Amino acid sequence: STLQKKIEEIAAKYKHSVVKKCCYDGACVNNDETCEQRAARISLGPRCIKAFTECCVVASQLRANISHKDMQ
């Protein structure tokens, strides 16, 4: 039950490779801005973006240590 793993586990539920890369990218932690802001600078397609934003949100909450239960 290691973060890397857990995100690996969220990731794995995306089939397409290019989308999967997106989610790993959103996980990777940015310091000075939010999943939201970070997503604007991006010019990729709709699937990517939804994946990248969702991955970033989950990872941040996981960092928050909220139970999947308490997880939106």
Partner: protein, 254 residues
Amino acid sequence: ETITVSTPIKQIFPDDAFAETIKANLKKKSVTDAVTQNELNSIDQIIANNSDIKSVQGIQYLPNVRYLALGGNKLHDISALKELTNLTYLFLDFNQLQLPNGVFDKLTNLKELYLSPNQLQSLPDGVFDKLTNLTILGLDMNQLQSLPKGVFDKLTNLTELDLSYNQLQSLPKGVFDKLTQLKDLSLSYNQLKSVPDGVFDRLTSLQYIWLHDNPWDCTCPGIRYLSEWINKHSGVVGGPDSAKCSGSGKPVRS
């Protein structure tokens, strides 16, 4: 389509982003180098996700692509590929691409297609009909706003069909009625308020489905059929509590 002699990569592939992608695939040294016709034959698949690609022009020259994966900000002339019957798998993820007329008419072979939001905010009449072998159809996030009756009617071997993330407000009568083999259908994250009585009536080999996150009209004299179907089948991914009325939650008795 093809080539008489040697030739520079960048002459075939004027899209700079595409040329770079092709070079990486071809184990090139640069973009400048000329390519033999056989080399184009060697590549069978292409997978790129760069924001800077706006055209797969010169895509036609390489016949032996079986699998295309492309994501970008904008894609401009996917006409280059309307001629590839060797492509089984086509995944297109872009903020907008442009649907030519009849683009899909010649790729009889491909069984899996994922599309993107297009210019017309809709799917053109007869879009898919040449597509018999296609078993997987991803329309998720295409932002579609309506559906053309019979759009799906030629899609018999269609395993699954993802319509989540669009702005559909209604479904054409018997929209789904031509797929015996459909197993999973997702209709979540739309603008549905109600569905045609009998829509899901012929969906036998149908295992999973998604209905949550649509604003369903919960007035007594219409949705009973929808409620009955939900009560009378168990393919409902996320669990029938999920789908919900305006004001209320679950659907429910009445």
